[PDB]
């Protein structure tokens, strides 16, 4: 056992994987940010309908804790429509207005009827 290094470095000793004996909050703390609490209002204004005629671009208001991926998940999972891209902004009254341009198949007008705007 001929130690050819002039430092005594710390020996790599065993380390255990953690195994608890019991849960520590009894249940998974469920996601309160589902595909319902993300997408609050569809926007109905002058500019956000001009988008829907000529641009195939639905406009929503989304909770600010969401991101560009979860909006695409919520719009598919509620409305059965595809999403091309999301374009988000923290609106300066506080909410996150989210401009969603759909696929070239699905129609901005027929979906606008079925949600009512």
């Amino acid at each position: 056992k001929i130690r050819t290094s002039p430092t005594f470095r710390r020996p790599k000793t065993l380390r255990l994987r953690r195994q608890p004996k019991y849960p520590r909050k009894s249940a998974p703390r469920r996601n309160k940010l589902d595909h319902y609490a993300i997408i609050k209002f569809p926007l109905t204004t002058e500019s956000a309908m001009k988008k829907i005629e000529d641009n195939n671009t639905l406009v929503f208001i989304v909770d600010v804790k969401a991101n560009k991926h979860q909006i695409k998940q919520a719009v598919k999972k509620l409305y059965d429509i595809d999403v091309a891209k999301v374009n988000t902004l923290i609106r300066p009254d506080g909410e996150k207005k989210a401009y969603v341009r759909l696929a070239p198949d699905y129609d901005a007008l027929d979906v606008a009827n079925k949600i009512g705007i």
């Binding site: 001929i2 130690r3 050819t4 290094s5 002039p6 430092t7 005594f8």
Partner: protein, 234 residues
């Protein structure tokens, strides 16, 4: 066979590199090594008092093994058979109305106070003292006490080695108290040999001032200083 060379490197200075040599003396140990390495040195620099270098005047290797086989057979009852004895004889003494199926158990005693009572009242006959109980206060009253009482004592090596005949980690002291039938003849054959070193030479052990040994670097310095001073004389 055909074309294999030998390439000899020259490992001198300013040329072909050094190998992976020994490097045991030259390594920065952690703080807990260099304490425990200088500490063994530090006994050998300072002049120890005679009351504590009674250790390192130890019972030799031949005698202590003869003593351990003697001490192996008064091994106390382990808690598995302490369990088994009490569960056995309680049923035996209830089925055959056993008043005494046990006369006397002979065993060695363990611990210092269980020894020191028996030495003060002449109740034990051979005393076995460990080497390495690091509070040395627990020792230096024993070899004068067994001197004044006249119970022969031995200084032996391995505080764990006393523990192995007691089923415990350290044991520090074992007093042979009640010898067997076939074992007193074993005992006086030893107590002769143990008085021969320790008890008879108590005026010699009283004045062993160990230590005061320098380092071999500076000792070799004075030995070379003898040669030139002998060159003054030659």
């Amino acid at each position: 066979n055909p074309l294999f060379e030998k390439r000899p490197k020259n490992f001198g200075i300013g040329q072909d590199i050094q190998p992976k040599r020994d490097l045991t003396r030259f390594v920065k140990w952690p703080r807990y090594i260099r304490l425990q390495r200088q500490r063994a040195i530090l006994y050998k620099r300072l002049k120890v008092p005679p009351a504590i270098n009674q250790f390192t005047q130890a019972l030799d290797r031949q005698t202590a093994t003869q003593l351990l086989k003697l001490a192996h057979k008064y091994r106390p009852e382990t808690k598995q058979e302490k369990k088994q004895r009490l569960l056995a004889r309680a049923e035996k003494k209830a089925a055959g109305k056993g008043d005494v199926p046990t006369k006397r158990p002979p065993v060695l005693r363990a611990g210092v106070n269980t020894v020191t009572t028996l030495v003060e009242n002449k109740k034990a006959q051979l005393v076995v003292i460990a080497h390495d109980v690091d509070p040395i206060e627990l020792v230096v009253f024993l070899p004068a006490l067994c001197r004044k009482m006249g119970v022969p004592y031995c200084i032996i090596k391995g505080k764990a080695r006393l523990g192995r005949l007691v089923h415990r980690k350290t044991c520090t002291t074992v007093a042979f108290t009640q010898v067997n039938s076939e074992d007193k003849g074993a005992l006086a054959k030893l107590v002769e040999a143990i008085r021969t070193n320790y008890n008879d030479r108590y005026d010699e052990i009283r004045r062993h001032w160990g230590g005061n040994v320098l380092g071999p670097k500076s000792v070799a310095r004075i030995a070379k200083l003898e040669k030139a001073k002998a060159k003054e004389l030659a």
